[PDB]
UniProtKB/Swiss-Prot annotation, chains A, B:
Pfam families: ACP_syn_III, ACP_syn_III_C. This is Mycobacterial beta-ketoacyl-[acyl-carrier-protein] synthase III. One of its GO terms (molecular function) is beta-ketoacyl-acyl-carrier-protein synthase III activity. It comes from the Bacteria. The gene is fabH. It is an enzyme of class 2 (transferase). It comes from Mycobacterium tuberculosis (strain CDC 1551 / Oshkosh). Gene3D superfamilies: 3.40.47.10. Its EC number is 2.3.1.301. Keywords: Acyltransferase, Cytoplasm, Fatty acid biosynthesis, Fatty acid metabolism, Lipid biosynthesis, Lipid metabolism, Multifunctional enzyme, Transferase. The last Arg residue of the ACP-binding site is essential for the weak association between ACP/AcpP and FabH.
Amino acid sequence: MTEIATTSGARSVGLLSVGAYRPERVVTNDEICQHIDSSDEAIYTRTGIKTRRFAADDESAASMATEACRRALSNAGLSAADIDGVIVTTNTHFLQTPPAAPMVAASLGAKGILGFDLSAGCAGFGYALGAAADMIRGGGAATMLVVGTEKLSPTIDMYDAGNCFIFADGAAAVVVGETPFQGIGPTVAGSDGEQADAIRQDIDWITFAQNPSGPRPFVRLEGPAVFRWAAFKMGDVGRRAMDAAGVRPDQIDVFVPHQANSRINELLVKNLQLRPDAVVANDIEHTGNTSAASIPLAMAELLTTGAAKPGDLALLIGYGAGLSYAAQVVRMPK
Amino acid sequence: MTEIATTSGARSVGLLSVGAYRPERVVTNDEICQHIDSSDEAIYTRTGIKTRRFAADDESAASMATEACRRALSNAGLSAADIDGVIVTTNTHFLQTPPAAPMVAASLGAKGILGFDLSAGCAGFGYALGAAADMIRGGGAATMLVVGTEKLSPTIDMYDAGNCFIFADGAAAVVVGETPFQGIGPTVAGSDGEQADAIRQDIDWITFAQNPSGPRPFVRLEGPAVFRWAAFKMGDVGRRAMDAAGVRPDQIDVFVPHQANSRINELLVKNLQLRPDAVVANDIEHTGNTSAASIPLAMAELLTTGAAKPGDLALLIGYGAGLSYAAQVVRMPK
């Protein structure tokens, strides 16, 4: 009997561009210490954060995603029509349904293209990238939009003196398409579910809905557990991503780790054995932790400043919520 | 300069098995009719639903997902150690974070495997399937677990005579791996953002959180709009999926559309132009609309009753929320 046919596309794919959308409101550490017993320097030393952006009450994960996709398109000198699918990665979409992918697409003027929402915590960008790369090479699409968008501020607990100054809002997208040379290395991902409560929402929405007059949900973070994990585990992950990419550590030019903690990342940079002149993203200082949007936003800045240059060999390492991680070597877009 | 390396996997992948878990509680029409002004017949003739399962309070999307994965494993004659990654698709995970995927992986005794959550409405299964297939072929994995799990019950408004008898709970997983012959055809998907409000959550969790005294969030469905969309658009989708899989209509053995409405699917079976003896899933009659778990659960039944046998050529068509759709031809598992 007949066999089920297959499809395929360009085996060579990369980042054609990156677009970033940063909320207007600039929240300082002192503006946060209006409710916490800490200081400007106390936070900056323990976290490496000075300020971060917060989104307006009417803005959402979806609205910022679209806005970041429009810039990623422009920067790629593309039209919405040139996109065959969009993957939206986020953890702050506050509607069980409908997903946001099709919404985004509609606002972009391609309401009909394929797309879905992907959640894997602050490391959702790495999975979406690999997923888009696999789909293109599999012939499911020719060019795609991968956007990380987060609006964590509304989920932050004013009084929580352990993370109210960590999370921030934001969104950034990248265009993935065929390239004359391989631009996206193999994905190296994994997880540790036995520490799923390290980064979490303390109370589920249905339990809360059942008692409204009771405690409201809020994002919780056991910084220590996450610190020990990230700082001393993402080193091997990085070496695995570079290994599957066939590149030497001293061959990378840009290192973009998830902007969770500057003290974590300085640990990593030292562990990865990179070139003393490698460009490291320190974006967190003024962006804070934007979860799934983190890496994308960071890439966008290194490009803007011009520390990083289109075509540089970068190491992307995403880690966070539910204790999941995604890594891969890629070539910096535009 | 140097080369970003490229990986590769088996080119031929398929469904190795399917496992289904349906909640113990069996809710009848009359029970849902206690709270509405509708009838047993009235529902059954409009919808084709007579009974539906409901998960206990102590259960959740995650717990049922694990349960269904354990059966998919046993049915595939595998252990958790044989899985390289799990994709959890759902829209009833009541936590913004952490991701469910790693949690179900931990319960299976494989906390380290890669994995993420995917939401694309009732059509999230099709995307996850394609995504797994693409990953395997891409060498990012050899064997994966794709599970659709839903716990819609907690989001139902007993007082809503327009959809309080359509949604039900459940879960079901499949093992995807290398197979003698291609078992999963190319993916065909798309969406319709302009109709985002067709299946949705009236109030976002953050707006509600800022007013616990106000109306609680529920799931609202616009049956008519969805009906006119599904019934007269999923026909071309099906033809696309069969076209890309290099399969002719008459070749198809099993047609497994989303268990949305028996009347809808009834119209599709004709429009498709399958064989007069082509079997169709009628699982919805005692399962109801279980969103992302729908297709998987349906496949599991047709296999148990024997209406469908291992190796059969099936057409999967998922449609629903945020108005997204995913389709592909596959070979029924063993």
